């Protein structure tokens, strides 16, 4: 049995980046929002 051995999962990072609240989705929103700018996008990332 492999009971002791466990799978180290990096899926939370993938969920954080790709899904909502990720920097790519926020960048897409800033692009679609008329006031998208680098500073406001960065502070949006930090706040979220």
């Amino acid at each position: 049995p492999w009971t002791l051995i466990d799978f180290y999962d990096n899926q939370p990072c993938i969920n954080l980046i790709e899904s909502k609240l990720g920097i790519l989705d926020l960048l897409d929103e800033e692009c679609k929002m008329p006031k998208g700018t680098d500073d406001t996008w960065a502070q949006k990332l930090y706040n979220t």
Partner: protein, 96 residues
Amino acid sequence: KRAVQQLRACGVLETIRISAAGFPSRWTYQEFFSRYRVLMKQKDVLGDRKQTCKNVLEKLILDKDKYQFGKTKIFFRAGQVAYLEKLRADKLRAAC
């Protein structure tokens, strides 16, 4: 420097240590008997190498968790291969 930075990038060391946490080393019954005939005792030698080698390993290694018994190969933790090889070398050189 190149090797360590590229291994950090690849993250191979993480897989290495993860496998080291369990039983990375594996040894076949026939392979173990052939390699460890010196530590194998004549009185314990029998037709079935499985049980005899298991008993010899138990005598040599006190902790059960160190070795993982299997149907075909025995699996080991980090230090047992080095320990057994050191004992085998010492026995052989003393006999010679």
